[PDB]
Amino acid sequence: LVHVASVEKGRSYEDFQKVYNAIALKLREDDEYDNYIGYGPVLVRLAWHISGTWDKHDNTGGSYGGTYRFKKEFNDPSNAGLQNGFKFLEPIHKEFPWISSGDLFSLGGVTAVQEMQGPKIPWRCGRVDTPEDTTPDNGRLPDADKDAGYVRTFFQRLNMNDREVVALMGAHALGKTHLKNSGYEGGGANNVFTNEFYLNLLNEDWKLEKNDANNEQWDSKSGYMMLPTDYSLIQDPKYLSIVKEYANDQDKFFKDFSKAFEKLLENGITFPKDAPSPFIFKTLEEQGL
């Protein structure tokens, strides 16, 4: 399958900066969500789950088609909780009805990372909504109870290598787990994008415990948690080296995360040679807004 990016008619940087700014202003305004974490983390997770359905083998799934708007995908058990992000984006969709659904979902994740003081993430427009029958079946997103070999194999389907996997997982610094969504609980209330996932992995005293859903997770006394798949990144010697690298170099982590996250959000999309260059949006803070 080929999905060619098609720029929303007549739109340019300034139009998408306006959408970014509306998302960013709403992030600031609706600060109470999830015990004052705000919507940033769930928007990052939404952007990832709408992209992470991709299969490199046949170009099914992926962000292009905006298929999360359809019930089969909306109701994937793996997506429990993301409805909160969707609801956040509804007024944005209403104000800017011209932006495609995949563009909106992916731009929500970019805006969230940047407004949380993360790296700049270049972003390209032109995803085009596709019909309900193009929605991927449930079961393409990863399980959390597994080991490093599972993680490694899983991410090959998304064309991600060890460095890209470890970099992407650093998003688990953000937000928290919720027992009712995933069968995992805790992790704090962080809404600042940092390399602390890696520092916490290396420096905390982790205990393997059973949570109230009878699933195993690693807990620290300071309130952080690691999923089994997170902890696998320090069990496997190749992953461990990269964890150490990112724990010791904030800038390197930022740069690698930015590349991997853009790639994730763009998997499956063919950009014409004369497509616009990727946009780098200014934060509200940079604009004095």
The annotation status of 35 as a binding-site residue, yes or no, is no
Q: What backbone torsions phi and psi does residue 279 show, to the nearest 5 degrees?
A: -85, 140
**Contact call for residues 267 and 55 (beta carbons, < 8 A):** no
The annotation status of 93 as a binding-site residue, yes or no, is no
Report residue 243 as tokens: 């964890």
Q: Which is nearer to ligand HEM, 130 or 185 (CB)?
A: 185
Q: Which is nearer to ligand HEM, 65 or 81 (CB)?
A: 81
Q: How far apart are CA 140 and CA 246, in angstroms?
A: 28
Q: Is 171 in the site for ligand HEM (CB under 6 A)?
A: yes
**Contact call for residues 243 and 198 (beta carbons, < 8 A):** yes
| 49 residue type, one letter | H
Give the alpha-carbon dihedral of 22, 23, 29, 30, to 10 degrees.
140
Shortest Cβ distance from residue 53 to ligand HEM (Å)?
A: 13
- Choices 179-187, 197-205, 214-222, 242-250; region in contact with ligand HEM by CB under 6 A: 179-187
The annotation status of 49 as a binding-site residue, yes or no, is no
User: Helix H segments across 53-100?
Assistant: 71-74, 83-95
Helix (H) or strand (E) holding 235: helix 228-235
Report residue 105 as tokens: 């979902």
The annotation status of 57 as a binding-site residue, yes or no, is no
Q: Is 48 in the site for ligand HEM (CB under 6 A)?
A: yes
Q: Is 65 in the site for ligand HEM (CB under 6 A)?
A: no
Q: Is 168 in the site for ligand HEM (CB under 6 A)?
A: yes
Angle between helices 101-115 and 83-95 (to 10 degrees): 110
Q: Which of 93, 120, 178, 259 binds ligand HEM (CB under 6 A)?
A: 178
- Choices 98-106, 126-134, 170-178, 276-284; region in contact with ligand HEM by CB under 6 A: 170-178
Q: Which is nearer to ligand HEM, 92 or 151 (CB)?
A: 151
Nearest to 264, CA basis, from 130, 144, 114, 102: 102
Q: Is 181 in the site for ligand HEM (CB under 6 A)?
A: yes
Q: Which is nearer to ligand HEM, 124 or 176 (CB)?
A: 176
Report residue 250 as tokens: 């904030």
Residues making contact with ligand HEM (CB under 6 A): 41-42, 44-45, 48, 81, 142, 144, 151, 168-169, 171-172, 174-178, 181-182, 184, 227, 229, 261
Give the annotated binding-site residues.
45, 48, 172, 176, 178, 181-182
